[PDB]
Design a binder for this molecule. Sequence first.
Ligand SMILES: Cc1ncc(COP(=O)(O)O)c(CN[C@H](C(=O)O)[C@@H](C)O)c1O
Ligand SMILES: Cc1ncc(COP(=O)(O)O)c(CN[C@H](C(=O)O)[C@@H](C)O)c1O
Lengths: 394, 394
Amino acid sequence: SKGKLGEKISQFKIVEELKAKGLYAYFRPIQSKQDTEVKIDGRRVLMFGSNSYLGLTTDTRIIKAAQDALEKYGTGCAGSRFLNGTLDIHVELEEKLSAYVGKEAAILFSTGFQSNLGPLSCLMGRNDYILLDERDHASIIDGSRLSFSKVIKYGHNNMEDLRAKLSRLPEDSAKLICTDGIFSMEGDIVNLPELTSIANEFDAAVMVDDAHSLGVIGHKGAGTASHFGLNDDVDLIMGTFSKSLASLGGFVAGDADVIDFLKHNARSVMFSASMTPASVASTLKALEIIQNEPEHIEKLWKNTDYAKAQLLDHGFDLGATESPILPIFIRSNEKTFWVTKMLQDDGVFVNPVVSPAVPAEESLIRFSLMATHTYDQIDEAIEKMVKVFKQAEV
Amino acid sequence: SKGKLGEKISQFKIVEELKAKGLYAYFRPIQSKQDTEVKIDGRRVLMFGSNSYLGLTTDTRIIKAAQDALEKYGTGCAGSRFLNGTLDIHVELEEKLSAYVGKEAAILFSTGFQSNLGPLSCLMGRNDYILLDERDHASIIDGSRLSFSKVIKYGHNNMEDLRAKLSRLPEDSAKLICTDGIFSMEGDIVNLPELTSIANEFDAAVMVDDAHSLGVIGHKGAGTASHFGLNDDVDLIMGTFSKSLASLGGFVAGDADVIDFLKHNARSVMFSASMTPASVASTLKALEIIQNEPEHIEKLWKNTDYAKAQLLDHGFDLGATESPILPIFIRSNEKTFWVTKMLQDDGVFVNPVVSPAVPAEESLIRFSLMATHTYDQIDEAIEKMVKVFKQAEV
Ligand SMILES: Cc1ncc(COP(=O)(O)O)c(CN[C@H](C(=O)O)[C@@H](C)O)c1O
Ligand SMILES: Cc1ncc(COP(=O)(O)O)c(CN[C@H](C(=O)O)[C@@H](C)O)c1O
C-alpha cells in the first residue's frame, strides 16, 4: 500500500525540475561500445566521463576471451562460489591477482561494491572499531555499517585526526582502517606511509580500496601499496574489475588465513551468485595485457599530463588530483548542471558532482582520461569546454 | 598490522577441520558449463545443487546473444547507470521486465544482492519501520540494516506476529514489509494474500523478492504476485537474473515515481558499475524464451513432481516445499557434511544446510530440479542418495 510511501518520495523534486528545464543529462542510453567516442541518439560524443582508464573494453583479444568463455562455460554459474558456483577460471583469476598485488591469496566478488561489503562486514565485531577516511567510497561506509563494530570517520587524509581517534580507543579491541587508494572525487592519493605508520603503532589492520589505482599507479599498475613500497604494511588489498580491467566484479587479496575466513564468512560472497564466465575471462585477459604491454599505462599518463597542463594553461581551476581524474571546479550547482548538459549537447561527456554530495561552492565536473584518447580529442573537448564555460559565465 | 586481526579469525576452525577429515566439499572448481552434469577434476557429476531452474545457461541462443552483445558493446560499461554506464539494451530490459511483471517501470542492478540493498536502504528512514520475515534472504536483512529505519523481524510466515508488531507502531510513521516469495531453505511460499491484507489495513508498502519465483511460479513464470493475482497489492517486485534467467544482475519493478526515486537515491545503483552488455543480452534472450516456450516451466514441474514423489516413496523426510527446491532432512551437522562429501565423491552434487544457519536437528541437504534434468538422472541420483544415507546411518 502506498499512502506513507508516496509521502516518503514526495519531496524529491530535483529530477522533475532538471527534466522540465531541459537540463537532465543522466541515464543517457549509449548505443555503442564504451570508447573515446560513444553514440547517443545516433550522434557521436567524446567520452571524458569513463572509468575505463586503459581503453580496454574495446580490445578484441579481451572480447574474444569473453566470447570463448561463453562458448565453453555458458552464460552464468547459477550459484554461490562455496556451493555450485566456482569455476576453475575463478580460481585461476584469484591466483593471478594474488601474484599481481603480491599477496598469498584472493577471493573474488561479483561486484566491486560487494568486495568492500565482505571484509568490512565480518572482520571487526562487537567491541571493535572501523576507522574510515570521511571521503571513502559509499561501498566502504555501507560495508562498515553492516559490521557489528563501531564505525568512526576521520578527516580526509588527516593523519593527526586518525591518530587522535585511535588513541581514545580501548587497547583490548581490534581496529581496522579502510581507505580509498586514489579517491575519485578529487583524484588524490591516500597518505599511505603515515597511515600505515599509525596503524603499526596501534596494531590496526589496514585495508586499501584500489578501484581507481589498479592499472593506474604502482609497478605495472599493481596499485597503491605497490606505489609506496608498503605491501608488507597493508593487510588487505581490495580492487574492482569495472575500471582499468574493463569488466565487472572485484576481489580482496591478503594472507591465506584471513582470505579463508572471508570467503566462508562474508555474506556478500556466501549469498550472491559468482561472476559470469565471460567477466572472469575478460578480467584475466585484461590483467595479462596490463602487465605485458606497458604502453597502455604510459599513454594513460601521457594523456593525463597533457590534458592537465592544457586545462591549467586555459585557466581552469583544478582540484588536488594525482591521477587521470581531473576535477574542474564550477562552484554553483545550477552552473554545473547547465555546463554538463550544454557540453553533452555539444558532443562532450563529463560527470557532474553537485549537492548534496558536495557543497554548492565545491560543485565540479570530472574529466577523466583513457589510454586510447588522442591529443586531438583532448584539444576538441577543451575547445568546447572553454566555449561552454564562456556561455555559462564561469 | 595483524595482531588483533589474527585474534579475530583464530576461533574459526571448522574449515581446517573439514579439510583435515577429508569432508571439505566447498568451492569445488567446475570445469564445464553449469548443466545437469558438470565436470570436476575431470570426472562427471550430476548437478542437483543449482539455481538454474530452466537449464538455460547452456541454451545456444542465449550464448549467441551474449557473444553478439560483446561484439557490439564490448566487455563492460565502466560507469554507473546515471552517468556513463547506461546502454539502450539496459533500458530495453527494464521496459521488458516491467511488462513481464505488470508494473510501470523497473531499475536494474548489477547483482540480485544489490537489488535488495537499493530499495531497503533508501525508502524507509528515521522514525520509519521495515518489517522482515525472519527467514528473509541475507541481502534483505543487509539492505534493511543500511536504512536509517528500525528493522523488526516477524515469525516465519506468521501473520498474527506481523499484524501484532505493526499494531504497536506509531500511526505517523511509514512502514515497509519485505518478504521472499519462495524461501530457498525449505522452498515454501509466502502467505501473500494475508500479508497484503494486513499491509492494506496498516498502509504498509509491500516488497516481494522473487529470486526463486521468476521462471518458476506465476503466469509464464512472472512470480509470486502473479501466482496469487495480487499485482495491485504489491508495491515493489524485486527479482534476480542469476537463477532461471541464467545470468547475473537483478531488478526492482514498481510505480514510475517510486522507481524514479530509487534509481536516483539507491547507493547500490548510484555507486556501482552497470551490468555488462553480455549479461543484459543473455537476460533479454532468456526472458523471451521463458515466455515464448512454455515447455521449460512445464518440465521443471514434471521433474519436480516426479522427484518429490520418488523421494517420499523411498522414505526421505522432506521439508514443507512448494517449489523445485526439495529439502531433505538429515538432523546432524556431522552426517550432513559426511553425506554431502560421499555423494560428491559418488557423482551427485547437493547443497548442505548446517549450523550456524540452522540447528543441528534441522540440518538438511537441498536437492533442486532443472527443466533439463531427465527422469533417468533423477533416478540415478536418488539410487546413490539411498546408498549414501544407508552408509551414513540416516
Ligand atoms: C531470495 C534471494 N534474494 C536475493 C538473492 C541475491 O541474488 P544474487 O546476487 O543474484 O545471487 C538470492 C541469492 N541466492 C543464492 C544464495 O544465497 O545462495 C545466490 C547464490 O544466488 C536469493 O536467494
Ligand atoms: C573507490 C571505489 N570502490 C568501490 C567501488 C565499487 O566498484 P563497482 O561495484 O565495481 O562499481 C567504486 C565504484 N566507483 C564508481 C562510482 O561509484 O561511480 C562505479 C560506477 O564503478 C569505487 O570508486
